[PDB]
């Protein structure tokens, strides 16, 4: 489904990186957030939902979607709650692979910037433009355009 | 051209809103930034360029693209410098109209949130999904997919 995104946080240098993966394409949106809080996740979801047609959110940590602020963002944006991760052999290992690739790229470009957030955005850019043939960026735009 | 974006800052409640308009579609990306600085504009451009294929940036304030940090972001992302705004009757008034519409929507939803940044993201969501027929969100994905 083109409306499914998986959101997870990863920790690096005492900072938190919120990583959203568009499951059907492997496209990533990421932000360095001041703390792993419900208010940060809610704000991130409102931004994401205004940029792409988000129908469902998945995660490897269900408790991060329990706060009143996150429930309010999903209610307002019309995003449906997902219990666990439904078995889908087509997307098996895709989210883990995209997160592994992003982490590797961050490590590879880290010394090119002072701030971790700068290295993270360089890594998102490299990841989204990398041809695998099409790139994740080309794939998401094709998937969504064809779904419209 | 599908690679042209116009970036400008607007001021509201003592805060700064950086508004990026995809000129061919009217699609918007916006963020509330802590101050009108070169480092904030540079970071915003790196994020934008990793999400969409940005070729050229326009603005109504040329001096905001003179810092070493902004020049570095454009160099790394391969974004070309534009002197003034070239005459294009097809896009006449589009950026001004999109900014006017965003400002009106912010005013309309402002009392639904505590934080201005929340109202801004609600406004971006409403703007991008509004059918004018297609929405700006549907138009950008069609323009970029067809350009690929
Ligand atoms: C924090 C920061 N400063 C930057 C720069 C560029 C110039 N300067 C000024 C400067 C002057 C003298 C130095 F000795 C020095 F080390 C840096 C980028 C920057 C901006 C864009 C960019 C890159 C860099 C390094 C790398 C490739 C992708 O695009 C930075 C940068 O921080 C912001 C993006 C927030 C401005 C950083 O983290 O280093
Ligand atoms: C700051 C903030 N808090 C929120 C909420 C929701 C619950 N709460 C807790 C709360 C509890 C008791 C209250 F009396 C009270 F006023 C708010 C949103 C929020 C989150 C998402 C959202 C909306 C709201 C209001 C409006 C529609 C779009 O989606 C907020 C919100 O701030 C963050 C998004 C940063 C969490 C805000 O600015 O109000
Ligand atoms: C998504 As984690 C908080
Ligand atoms: C809470 As979310 C879907
Ligand atoms: C774009 As204004 C600083
Ligand atoms: C400096 As920018 C193009």
Numbering used by the authors:
A (entry chain A), B (entry chain A): 57 to 188, 193 to 208
Quote the paper.
During the early steps of HIV infection, IN catalyzes the initial covalent attachment of the viral cDNA to host cell nuclear DNA. The catalytic core domain (residues 50–212) adopts an RNase H superfamily fold and contains a D,D-35-E motif that binds Mg2+ or Mn2+ ions, which mediate DNA cleaving and joining. IN function is assisted by the cellular cofactor lens epithelium-derived growth factor (LEDGF/p75), which binds tightly to a site at the catalytic core domain dimer interface. An additional class of IN inhibitors, the allosteric inhibitors of integrase (ALLINIs), act at a second site on HIV IN.
To investigate the structural basis for ALLINI function, we studied GSK1264 (described in) and GSK002, which is newly reported here. Structures of the GSK1264, BI-D, and tetraphenylarsonium (TPA) complexes were reported previously; the structure of GSK002 bound to the catalytic core domain at 1.75 Å is newly reported here. To investigate the mechanism of GSK002 resistance further, we determined three high-resolution crystal structures, one of GSK002 bound to catalytic core domain-only, one of GSK002 bound to the catalytic core domain containing the Ala124 substitution, and one of GSK002 bound to the catalytic core domain with Thr125. The protein structures were quite similar, with RMSDs ranging from 0.09 to 0.13 Å in pairwise comparisons. A small steric clash is also predicted for GSK002, in which the difluorobenzyl group collides with Trp235. However, rotation of the Trp235 side chain could create enough space for the inhibitor, so we suggest that GSK002 could be accommodated in a nearly identical interface. Thus, this analysis supports the concept that CTD–ALLINI–catalytic core domain interactions are relevant to aggregation in vitro and that the shape and positioning of the ALLINI molecule is critical for the aggregation reaction. We speculate that the IN polymer formed in the presence of GSK002 is similar to that seen for GSK1264, with side chains remodeled to accommodate the interaction, but how these small structural differences influence inhibitor potency and escape mechanisms is just beginning to be studied.
